[PDB]
Design a protein around this ligand. Structure first.
Ligand SMILES: *C(#N)C1([N]C(=O)[C]([C]S(=O)(=O)[C][C]2[C][C]C(=O)[N]2)[N][C](C2=[C][C]=C(F)[C]=[C]2)C(F)(F)F)[C][C]1
Length: 218
């Protein structure tokens, strides 16, 4: 039995919404967001982790292209291989590709492994969000409606399961009979509901939200 609604922000496991700017680092923000929650659950401290560290260091060897895109899963593996990721405070976000400047003296978190959920299973995603924590996911954000979203439960008739934008599911619930996934984006506070978007849930893997979900563990 799972709770009807979940919001990890109530549990103090979600940091301030970030602004990626003109740099395509959504994948990096998605990954650090997921790990930030695990760090809070393990140490009791909520700390924004360095998305820049991922953009600059989890590069070619991880199939990523910095400001031109990347994978949340390979980002997690980089953190594992590297034995750490720096804090955002020590390695600030500059919205541009830079030479890797990771330094263990600024390490704020570690990762031991990550898990990728089965393709398109929203019930499994619900279970992970309820029992494990925020989950990194990709969504189809190639439609105007996504950019113009302001409030309520987002539903786009033209959405597909071909995902291109990395975000973070930090909860789920329902608005007047309409089920949704609570998603943290990285487009600043002017986007949607002050940085968040509630996307249609249990509507046939709408916009591919449950297509490629993953979460790290410490
Ligand atoms: C953001 N900002 C942008 N997107 C990405 O970096 C996406 C993130 S995603 O959640 O869509 C990843 C998933 C995994 C399976 C899939 O098809 N998308 N990654 C893209 C990407 C990855 C690697 C690369 F070198 C360039 C792009 C994607 F979608 F093609 F995989 C806008 C950057």
């Amino acid at each position: 039995i799972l709770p009807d609604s979940v919001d990890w922000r109530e549990k103090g496991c979600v940091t301030e919404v970030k602004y990626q700017g003109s740099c395509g680092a959504c994948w990096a923000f998605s990954a650090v967001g997921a790990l930030e929650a695990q760090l809070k659950l393990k140490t009791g401290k909520l700390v924004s982790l360095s998305a820049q560290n991922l953009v600059d260091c989890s590069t070619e060897k991880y199939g990523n292209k910095g400001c031109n895109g990347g994978f949340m899963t390979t980002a997690f593996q980089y953190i594992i291989d590297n034995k750490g990721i720096d804090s955002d405070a020590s390695y600030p976000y500059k919205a541009m590709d830079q030479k890797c400047q990771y330094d263990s003296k600024y390490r704020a978190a570690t990762c031991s492994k990550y898990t990728e959920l089965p393709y398109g299973r929203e019930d499994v995603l619900k279970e992970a969000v309820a029992n494990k924590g925020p989950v990194s996911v990709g969504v189809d954000a190639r439609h105007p409606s996504f950019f113009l979203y302001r409030s309520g439960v987002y539903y786009e008739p033209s959405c597909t399961q071909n995902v291109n934008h990395g975000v973070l599911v930090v909860g789920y619930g329902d608005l007047n009979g309409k089920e949704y996934w609570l998603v943290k984006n990285s487009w600043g506070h002017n986007f949607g509901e002050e940085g968040y978007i509630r996307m249609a849930r249990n509507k046939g893997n709408h916009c591919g939200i449950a297509s490629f979900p993953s979460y790290p563990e410490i």
